[PDB]
Amino acid sequence: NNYDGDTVTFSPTGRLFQVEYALEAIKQGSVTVGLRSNTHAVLVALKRNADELSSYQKKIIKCDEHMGLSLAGLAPDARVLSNYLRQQCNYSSLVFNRKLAVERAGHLLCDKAQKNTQSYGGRPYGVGLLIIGYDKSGAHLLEFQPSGNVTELYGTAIGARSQGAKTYLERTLDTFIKIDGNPDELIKAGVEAISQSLRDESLTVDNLSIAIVGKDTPFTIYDGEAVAKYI
Amino acid sequence: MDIILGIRVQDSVILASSKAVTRGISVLKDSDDKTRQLSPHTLMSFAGEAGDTVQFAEYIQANIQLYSIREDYELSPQAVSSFVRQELAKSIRSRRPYQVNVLIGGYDKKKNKPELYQIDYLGTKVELPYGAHGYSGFYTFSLLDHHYRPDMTTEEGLDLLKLCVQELEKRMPMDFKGVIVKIVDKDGIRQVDDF
Amino acid sequence: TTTLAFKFQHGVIAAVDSRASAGSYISALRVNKVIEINPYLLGTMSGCAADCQYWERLLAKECRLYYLRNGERISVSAASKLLSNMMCQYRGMGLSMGSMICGWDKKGPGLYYVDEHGTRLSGNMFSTGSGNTYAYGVLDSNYKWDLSVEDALYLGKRSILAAAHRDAYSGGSVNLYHVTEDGWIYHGNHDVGELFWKVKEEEGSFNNVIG
Amino acid sequence: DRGVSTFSPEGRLFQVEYSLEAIKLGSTAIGIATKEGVVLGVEKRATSPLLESDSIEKIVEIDRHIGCAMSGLTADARSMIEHARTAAVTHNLYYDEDINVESLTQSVCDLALRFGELMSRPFGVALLIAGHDADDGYQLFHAEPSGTFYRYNAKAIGSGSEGAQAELLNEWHSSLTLKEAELLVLKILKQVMEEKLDENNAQLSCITKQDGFKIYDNEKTAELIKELKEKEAAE
Amino acid sequence: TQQPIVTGTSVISMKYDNGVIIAADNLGSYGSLLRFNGVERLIPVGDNTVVGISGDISDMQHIERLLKDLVTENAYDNPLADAEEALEPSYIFEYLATVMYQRRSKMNPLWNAIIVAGVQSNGDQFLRYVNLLGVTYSSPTLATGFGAHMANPLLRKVVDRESDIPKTTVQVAEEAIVNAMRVLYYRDARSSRNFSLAIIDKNTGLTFKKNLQVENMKWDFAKDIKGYGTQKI
Amino acid sequence: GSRRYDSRTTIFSPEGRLYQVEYALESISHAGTAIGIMASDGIVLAAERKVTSTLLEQDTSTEKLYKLNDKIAVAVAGLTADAEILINTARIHAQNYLKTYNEDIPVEILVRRLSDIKQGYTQHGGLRPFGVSFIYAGYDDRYGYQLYTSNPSGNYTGWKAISVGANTSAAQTLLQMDYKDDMKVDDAIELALKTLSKTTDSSALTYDRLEFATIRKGANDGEVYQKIFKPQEIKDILVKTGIT
Amino acid sequence: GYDRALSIFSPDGHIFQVEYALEAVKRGTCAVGVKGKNCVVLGCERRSTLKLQDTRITPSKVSKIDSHVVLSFSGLNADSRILIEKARVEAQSHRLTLEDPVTVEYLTRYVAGVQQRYTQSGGVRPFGVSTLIAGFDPRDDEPKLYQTEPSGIYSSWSAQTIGRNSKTVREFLEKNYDRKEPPATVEECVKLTVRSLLEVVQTGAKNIEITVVKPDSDIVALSSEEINQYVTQIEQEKQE
Amino acid sequence: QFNPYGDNGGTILGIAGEDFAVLAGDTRNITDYSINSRYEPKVFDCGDNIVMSANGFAADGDALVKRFKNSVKWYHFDHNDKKLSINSAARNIQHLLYSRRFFPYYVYNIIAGLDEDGKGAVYSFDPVGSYQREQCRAGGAAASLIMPFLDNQVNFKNQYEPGTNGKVKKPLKYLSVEEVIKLVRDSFTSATERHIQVGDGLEILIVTKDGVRKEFYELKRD
Ligand SMILES: *[C@@](C)(CO)[C@](*)(O)[C@H](Cc1ccccc1)NC(=O)[C@H](Cc1ccc(OC)cc1)NC(=O)[C@H](C)NC(=O)C1=CC2=CCC=CC2=C1C
Numbered sequence A: 001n002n003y004d005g006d007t008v009t010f011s012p013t014g015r016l017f018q019v020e021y022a023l024e025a026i027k028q029g030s031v032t033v034g035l036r037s038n039t040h041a042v043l044v045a046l047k048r049n050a051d052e053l054s055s056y057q058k059k060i061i062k063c064d065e066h067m068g069l070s071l072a073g074l075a076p077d078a079r080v081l082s083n084y085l086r087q088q089c090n091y092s093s094l095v096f097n098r099k100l101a102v103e104r105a106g107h108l109l110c111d112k113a114q115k116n117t118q119s120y121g122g123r124p125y126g127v128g129l130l131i132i133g134y135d136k137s138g139a140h141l142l143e144f145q146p147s148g149n150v151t152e153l154y155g156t157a158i159g160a161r162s163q164g165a166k167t168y169l170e171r172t173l174d175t176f177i178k179i180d181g182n183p184d185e186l187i188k189a190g191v192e193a194i195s196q197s198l199r200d201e202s203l204t205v206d207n208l209s210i211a212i213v214g215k216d217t218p219f220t221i222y223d224g225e226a227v228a229k230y231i
Numbered sequence B: 001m002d003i004i005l006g007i008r009v010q011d012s013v014i015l016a017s018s019k020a021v022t023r024g025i026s027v028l029k030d031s032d033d034k035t036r037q038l039s040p041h042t043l044m045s046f047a048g049e050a051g052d053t054v055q056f057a058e059y060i061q062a063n064i065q066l067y068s069i070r071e072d073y074e075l076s077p078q079a080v081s082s083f084v085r086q087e088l089a090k091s092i093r094s095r096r097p098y099q100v101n102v103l104i105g106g107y108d109k110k111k112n113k114p115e116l117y118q119i120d121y122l123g124t125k126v127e128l129p130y131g132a133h134g135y136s137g138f139y140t141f142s143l144l145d146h147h148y149r150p151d152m153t154t155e156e157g158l159d160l161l162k163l164c165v166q167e168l169e170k171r172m173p174m175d176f177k178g179v180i181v182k183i184v185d186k187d188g189i190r191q192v193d194d195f
Numbered sequence C: 001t002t003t004l005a006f007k008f009q010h011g012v013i014a015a016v017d018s019r020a021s022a023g024s025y026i027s028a029l030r031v032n033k034v035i036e037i038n039p040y041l042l043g044t045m046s047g048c049a050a051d052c053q054y055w056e057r058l059l060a061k062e063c064r065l066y067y068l069r070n071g072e073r074i075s076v077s078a079a080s081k082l083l084s085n086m087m088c089q090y091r092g093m094g095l096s097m098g099s100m101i102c103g104w105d106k107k108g109p110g111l112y113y114v115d116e117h118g119t120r121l122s123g124n125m126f127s128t129g130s131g132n133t134y135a136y137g138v139l140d141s142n143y144k145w146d147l148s149v150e151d152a153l154y155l156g157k158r159s160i161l162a163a164a165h166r167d168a169y170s171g172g173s174v175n176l177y178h179v180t181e182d183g184w185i186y187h188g189n190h191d192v193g194e195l196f197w198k199v200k201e202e203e204g205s206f207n208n209v210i211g
Numbered sequence D: 001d002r003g004v005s006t007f008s009p010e011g012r013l014f015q016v017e018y019s020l021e022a023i024k025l026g027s028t029a030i031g032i033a034t035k036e037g038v039v040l041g042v043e044k045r046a047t048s049p050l051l052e053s054d055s056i057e058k059i060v061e062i063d064r065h066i067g068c069a070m071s072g073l074t075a076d077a078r079s080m081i082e083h084a085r086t087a088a089v090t091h092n093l094y095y096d097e098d099i100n101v102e103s104l105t106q107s108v109c110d111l112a113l114r115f116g117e118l119m120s121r122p123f124g125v126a127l128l129i130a131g132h133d134a135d136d137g138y139q140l141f142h143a144e145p146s147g148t149f150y151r152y153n154a155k156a157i158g159s160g161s162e163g164a165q166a167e168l169l170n171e172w173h174s175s176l177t178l179k180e181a182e183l184l185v186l187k188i189l190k191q192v193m194e195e196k197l198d199e200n201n202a203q204l205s206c207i208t209k210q211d212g213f214k215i216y217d218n219e220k221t222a223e224l225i226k227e228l229k230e231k232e233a234a235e
Numbered sequence E: 001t002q003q004p005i006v007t008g009t010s011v012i013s014m015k016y017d018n019g020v021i022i023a024a025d026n027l028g029s030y031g032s033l034l035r036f037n038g039v040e041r042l043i044p045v046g047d048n049t050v051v052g053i054s055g056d057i058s059d060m061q062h063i064e065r066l067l068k069d070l071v072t073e074n075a076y077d078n079p080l081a082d083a084e085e086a087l088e089p090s091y092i093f094e095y096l097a098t099v100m101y102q103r104r105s106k107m108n109p110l111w112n113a114i115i116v117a118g119v120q121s122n123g124d125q126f127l128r129y130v131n132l133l134g135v136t137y138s139s140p141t142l143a144t145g146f147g148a149h150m151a152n153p154l155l156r157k158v159v160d161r162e163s164d165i166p167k168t169t170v171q172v173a174e175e176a177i178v179n180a181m182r183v184l185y186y187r188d189a190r191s192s193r194n195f196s197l198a199i200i201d202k203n204t205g206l207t208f209k210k211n212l213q214v215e216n217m218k219w220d221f222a223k224d225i226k227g228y229g230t231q232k233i
Numbered sequence F: 001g002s003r004r005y006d007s008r009t010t011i012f013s014p015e016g017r018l019y020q021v022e023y024a025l026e027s028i029s030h031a032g033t034a035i036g037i038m039a040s041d042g043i044v045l046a047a048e049r050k051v052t053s054t055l056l057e058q059d060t061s062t063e064k065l066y067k068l069n070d071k072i073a074v075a076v077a078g079l080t081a082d083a084e085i086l087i088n089t090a091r092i093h094a095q096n097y098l099k100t101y102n103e104d105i106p107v108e109i110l111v112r113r114l115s116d117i118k119q120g121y122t123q124h125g126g127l128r129p130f131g132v133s134f135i136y137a138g139y140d141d142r143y144g145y146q147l148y149t150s151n152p153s154g155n156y157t158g159w160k161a162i163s164v165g166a167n168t169s170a171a172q173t174l175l176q177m178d179y180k181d182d183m184k185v186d187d188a189i190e191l192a193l194k195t196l197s198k199t200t201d202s203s204a205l206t207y208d209r210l211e212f213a214t215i216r217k218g219a220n221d222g223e224v225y226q227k228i229f230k231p232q233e234i235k236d237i238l239v240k241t242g243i244t
Numbered sequence G: 001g002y003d004r005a006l007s008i009f010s011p012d013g014h015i016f017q018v019e020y021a022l023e024a025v026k027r028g029t030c031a032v033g034v035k036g037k038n039c040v041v042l043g044c045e046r047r048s049t050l051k052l053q054d055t056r057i058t059p060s061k062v063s064k065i066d067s068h069v070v071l072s073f074s075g076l077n078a079d080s081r082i083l084i085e086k087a088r089v090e091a092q093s094h095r096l097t098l099e100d101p102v103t104v105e106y107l108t109r110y111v112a113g114v115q116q117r118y119t120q121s122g123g124v125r126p127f128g129v130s131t132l133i134a135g136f137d138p139r140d141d142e143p144k145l146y147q148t149e150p151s152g153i154y155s156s157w158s159a160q161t162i163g164r165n166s167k168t169v170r171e172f173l174e175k176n177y178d179r180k181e182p183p184a185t186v187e188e189c190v191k192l193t194v195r196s197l198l199e200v201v202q203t204g205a206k207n208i209e210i211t212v213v214k215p216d217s218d219i220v221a222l223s224s225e226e227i228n229q230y231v232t233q234i235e236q237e238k239q240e
Numbered sequence H: 001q002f003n004p005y006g007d008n009g010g011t012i013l014g015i016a017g018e019d020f021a022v023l024a025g026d027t028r029n030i031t032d033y034s035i036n037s038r039y040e041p042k043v044f045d046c047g048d049n050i051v052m053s054a055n056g057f058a059a060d061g062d063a064l065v066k067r068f069k070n071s072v073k074w075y076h077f078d079h080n081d082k083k084l085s086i087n088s089a090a091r092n093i094q095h096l097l098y099s100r101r102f103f104p105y106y107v108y109n110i111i112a113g114l115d116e117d118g119k120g121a122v123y124s125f126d127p128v129g130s131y132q133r134e135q136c137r138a139g140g141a142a143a144s145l146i147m148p149f150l151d152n153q154v155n156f157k158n159q160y161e162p163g164t165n166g167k168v169k170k171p172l173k174y175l176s177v178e179e180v181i182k183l184v185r186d187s188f189t190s191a192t193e194r195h196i197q198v199g200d201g202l203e204i205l206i207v208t209k210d211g212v213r214k215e216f217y218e219l220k221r222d
């Protein structure tokens, strides 16, 4: 109300409204799902178009051979943050000959987002990210919020109508975690999960976007007729 | 570059400057004009290290031309020469000094007098009836000391200048490929096409 | 190296050798010492190979941007000056670059000599490199403004040959260019080994050499 | 007052949303992509008859294989074009090749959100970036001041955009020829323009693989206008 | 640009079937003066890596602190610091190699020659060299300073190529290293009798031996040597 | 943050005026009147000190008339402290020009420089403008005797006769009435004092409430002399012109 | 440094500071530009509220940027000096780096770029100035006339006016200026420029300034008597 | 005084075939008269069917390769996984080298691969960034030993058709991969004999449309 003019101002109840408004931009964004087993990790994203003449906005970005994310909210802010991750993943390789741990990647994103919430002049990031990866401790899935909060999960979803997919994963928890050494069945579970967040529209060939990473699988993105198999 | 001469007569200033440009052991050009018009009644000849000469001259030219447009007025030769000196005196203590010696010949329209200024790369300014830079003065000053009068005509000034160039051509080891002569008077700047 | 270029009635000729040295060692028999900046602009190379390539390929970037902003092709005078200005920033830092900027523009054909010192000279004829003195001898005695294109191409070709023979750090092959108002025209790669013997027989020159 | 980089309660940047309103006031620009090329066309909209219309430059060359049309506060576009041209030629310097249309568009869009308290406000102009490369062929992009860019088969921006976009919805198909696309841009421009369309108050351009980016002459466009009138009178 | 003041001499090492061995004497010389007799130039990093350093001791102490701080920093927000995400020899080496090359590029080098010896997660042997110039190389045997000239020849008689590594036991390899250290004591004027030796095995882990001495030395034949040619008495 | 407390000194009004410049001019309108009159053989500068006291040391006082160099002087209207900042800058510019070109600075060039500084404070920096208006009286060999004025907007204009400060409307009418082109310095002196005498808010115009100066070629042969009038000399010229 | 964003968008998509800068231009004295077949003329109003002025030394309204290009303006006087200075520096800078004088189109594009930069830079306000830039390109006999404004947009004009009551004189020019046949001579061009100003000026005495620019750096300013003869002839034809 | 440069010896060799290319180099690393390693790889697969070797000062060579590999990575990120053509890689490397025009990478660099028409390609560089496409090129310590041999046995220089009185040249052909590898091995065997910094081992990387293949051969260890 009087305490939402900038990010440097607490409300009387201890809330940061500019951060909460940035969180709102994620809810307006298109749905995206993340889930993992012990061997693989999967991202599934519903892409959005402007109209019938337009293309479908890309949702998934590669950060390294073993790491990448999907976005929901302001796409330019995802480009800034993913670029930062690319550099940090790269610094780890060039200096330490070491693939960046997914947990440490989350810690770096948290600390970058936080600086924007405590300083005058700047603004919070207006995007939520789902980071998947495979490192020395196996498969991982992270959820990033622009408040700074990063959370390691078995599965999750963010964006509009994401609550439906999140409930499904909460029921299926015991099933999909056990899908080891079978990438196609893990993607199926992800496609079935994101389907719980659909209304009116359904999954078409240029609508759906899928990404996967695993034990002997580099981070690869599937679009177009490559995902027709899963429709 | 090599030889630049200057002589102030009754009603004009005459500047002579060599035409040669040498890279290594080869003479690349024998028709080079070592001069820039700073204003309609002010001419500056120059000589020194390769590159620095033209860069400095063109930089001075741009500054004087900027002043002329801003004030809609031509600076006096004295004022221009002082500006040039300051730029060189500023330059000599720089990281990399500009290694350029100049002669400034101008006609002051206010005083109706020709004026010749000699300035070296250190920023050493002197007003003279006749001047030169480098080794040119060693050969020519004895002739000028003998033959120069202040009431000389432009034609007499050119004849005395021919005698100086002839002496240079006889006693200098270097072939400077003759000179381009330019006259500065009340009517402005013109080039003597046959010399 | 040995490069040359000269203006004449039907445009400008540009000829270069193709040798590259690393002391006494001939590191390359066939390098390209001419850069096509645009269909109406050429650039010769003499001195440090890296400097010549970098700065003239950077000149091409800048001449390209001129065309886009002004909707008009850059002049030879302006192009040469941009290059000389670049050299003056790295003045004293140790660059080694001698080049001719050849082309055709609104004022007709144009030819400018530019070097690492920031020197920029307009002229009808130039020659740069370790073997330029040999090339000048042939050029000065045979040059006319009234030359035919066929004779002019031969003159530049023959002038490089003269230098390639005598100068130890020049040779390999001869590259020819002819610049018209419709643009420049490449006129082949000519091996000096084969060209020497051909010229010796047809012209009768190089009597001193046995063949 | 309030921050320049402030979020609204709905989760949008106030300034970005306000810049979009300025673009709605701008003159109409239309782009249509085909397999034979991409066509770009604009409304010139001279404020007075004494204004020499040929000086109105709302269609612009970025590279030989990339063109650009603008709508909104057109003065803001000059630095965007300058950056685009520099990016296109700089990539050619570093990689000895033409730059991808998408990569060029992305480079332009990276400027968009560089505002705060960098420049003091977002750009007040939208761009239609059309081009061709070997990988993805003939492409048309719509670059906004939000930093977002969408690829389009056909797109209209400016004051008559939503009316034109509905028309482009019905008319566009994947087998359009270049000649058909030219007439289609002219048809839709004539529909949304206030004044009567002619060769002096409207401008056409295209990008083909062979000839590259070309702005059409007033004599060439005049014939395409006359060809349009006759084919509409044909039924 | 500087000059080294207090220096440490040769560091020698080699691979064997199950791991690596590394050794270095405990001397800190001040030119020709044998000033400091209790200097440890082998520095363990965790239980899987040993860094052996020769050259300037003040720069060695600086590196020793960078490594100590590297372990501290790795444990930060890392539940698997003593397991999967522990420091590896290849991580430690590349860090140093990055620092060494950066310092030489600023014309302010760390005046050292370093050998990183260790065993990786998968049981693979790691042995790589880096110096003040940022120059890196790997080999079945590695040595710095005088060791390069005298020790490597002896150690390469045991492991001449890669295929000789599985055939070499720890007893044979240690014996070869200890013999090499004796040879260096005979012939290196800036060496000492006292030295340290470290073994990193993939089964038995890190064994760090201190206060070792060169023994079984041959000197008796000196009594018979008289004069420099013609002298008999 | 800090934005909350920013007055924004460098913005346009909806009507296209600069708020702070307009308000600064309002400030200047309450300042003591200063008059400049240019004649064929010299220039006069007259100015009124503001409600003084008997205990003010007048002979060592200077609030209105300042010397920029030997050829150029200024009359001040507005904040004295602001004016001194600018005056010292102008004195330095004149000496920089002299050092560079070895010639005394032309009057207009000095005026333009100060006016450009004032302009800067209206377009960038977020600082308040200088609440000062100058009358420049000077001589150079190009244009001869010159009068200029500058105000907080940074705009400057040339004049034959001009007033700044209080009652300029009334003062400018009186000058426009009695001024003629063939006028001389002694006549201009009389006009300046008569104009102040009629426009003053004080009951009577006395020597202790005035600062006065002339720039004359009335110096021995082709050269220019600046005369800052002393208290006793102002008292004499008041009797001579018949005001007291 | 002072970084405050003064020029910003409003809910309706307007930048008020840029629009309020146009109001300052509306307040400024009238300026007019007319190009003939072989010349361009720049006319300027001088408000007669200021008498006792010294016209020798008072800043003239038309400014030379180079020997072949001129610039007149309407709006804040102090602001115009900054643009003119920058333009003059760029003109010499272009001659120095490219060895050709600026084209009128290039100089205009630069000045317009400066104006634009001041609409999206922190801590600064837009220039309260619109300019008319006229001249002839080097070795070209085609006349050039351009206009700029605070937003940074620019365009070429057969004839144009800016400043106070510019709406009225533009109305006059639109009906009086024929494109198919522009003022063939200098006389006809000046006459049309004076006529247009007489619609707005008040008295035709010292209120009208005229500056004729011809090809090949031939620029002259008319005197009071020369202009007064045009004023006399126009009204004598009008009495009919 | 501190000398930031050094000489790690070694020699490299690149040959372009009709539809293939090879990049070979010895595996010996040295300082002065000492051997550091008998097997220290010098030729690398940099991705996108491109191979690279920087010969001279190992620390500067490792740094350059490391940077180019990184340049390839960022080319994919920035340009939608587009394949970096061999000609584009060459130009990119010129700019990497000239970055240090005033503190050079003391290395002679060669890259090999296939052009966009599928033909074999080799590019050579000097330490400050001058580059050129070549058919044949040896670089490093024994470059002067090998290059004349390749002029003779690859481009058939000074070789004529017998009975033509030297009037007809030997016609130029392309060589098979099997024929090229023979010339590579004989080149290094010869260089090993007369150059002290060359020996120990020889590693060849062959590039075809099918990918990048390796071959290793022993050399004399003295
Ligand atoms: C003619 C052959 C005279 O030598 C002619 O000028 C050619 C011109 C040319 C060649 C190739 C492309 C364009 C133009 N000049 C050369 O071949 C040139 C001569 C030259 C050699 C060396 C230096 O500085 C050391 C300056 C000029 N040769 C080179 O540029 C060769 C390729 N450069 C080197 O071999 C070289 C070795 C080296 C080691 C460390 C740092 C730099 C080094 C360079 C440039």
Ligand SMILES: [Mg+2]
Residues within 6 Å of the ligand: B118, B119, B120, B124, B125, B126
């Ligand atoms: Mg002197």
Ligand SMILES: [Mg+2]
Residues within 6 Å of the ligand: H221, H222
């Ligand atoms: Mg040996």
